[PDB]
């Protein structure tokens, strides 16, 4: 059966995700007591050429460079180039599939250099400053960014205070940004999909359903405490509420414009004018808003409102 194989996959990914996070968080939180010393740094090379080259490569971090960038990293003394390396990392445009590599590299930095985490945090904050008054949203980057700062917290590079606080901040903006126009929906879904388990305490309907139906035991939430998760869950439901309002409105005004085309069908006979390419745009984005609403109701384990 197809349904069982998908559930086994979900279940397998869940555990891979969980085991990795647990392993990385342990190393990162334990980093301070065993960073290397002066003498060790002496034997790595501080050349400006190589360290600068490396900082540049960090602008295009890619999964298939995991080993190559790691190899270079281990030979360089990056003591003086933290701020620059942090800047490359924050600006770099990562695909969904590249974020784990970036986090891996961030962990090698963090585990070697005390200056890394404070710089990374500080530069992320500035970066969300620059965004707030620059106009034309760049949602593609904010999507990944949110996931990225999420992992960096889960993985213990940022402390709960620093990282949770930073994520809460950026989520608030999305909630406030998206009350009529729900333009960041895919950003909230991605965040939920990837990090909602540990940051928001999410347990989606699919996971619940798979667990009961196939007697699969899914990973426990053990990273962020339920108290710290609650605020995040509240925001998501409140967003979801807002999104369901916007779904109802657009249902009415789709069918108040279908049941208006019935008057303009009878009276003065049809004419598939520009209205026959305006309905093809109202019902395009509705279909996508319905898809995203279903997608997020599941992640949050909420029912969909009923659509006559």
Residue numbers in the entry: 121 to 428
What do the study's own words say?
MIF4G-1 helices hA, hB as well as their adjacent loops make extensive contacts with the 10-helix MIF4G core domain, in particular with helices h4, h6 and h8. Notably, Arg137 and Arg141 on hA form hydrogen bonds and salt bridges with Asp317 and Glu271 on the core MIF4G domain, and Leu144 on hA interacts with Val223 and Val275 on h4 and h6, respectively. Pro156, Phe160, Phe161 and Leu164 on hB form a hydrophobic patch interacting with Arg232 and Tyr233 on helix h4. Overall, helices hA, hB and h8i create an extensive network of interactions with the 10 conserved helices of MIF4G-1 core MIF4G domain. A highly conserved motif, 164-LDSSLKKNT-172, is located on the first turn of h1 and the loop immediately preceding it. Mapping of phylogenetically conserved residues on the solvent-accessible surface of MIF4G-1 shows that the motif and a series of downstream conserved charged residues (Lys176, Lys177, Lys179, Asp192, Lys200, Glu204 and Glu211) define a conserved patch at one extremity of the domain. Residues 430–486 at the C-terminus of the MIF4G-1 crystallization construct are disordered in the crystal structure. In addition to the N-terminal extension, MIF4G-1 contains two elongated helices (h9 and h10). The updated quasi-atomic model indicates that (i) the long coiled coil formed by helices h9 and h10 protruding from MIF4G-1 is in close proximity to and could contact the EJC, (ii) the loop between h9 and h10 contacts MIF4G-2 and (iii) the MIF4G-2 domain is positioned close to the Y14 subunit of the EJC likely forming a contact.
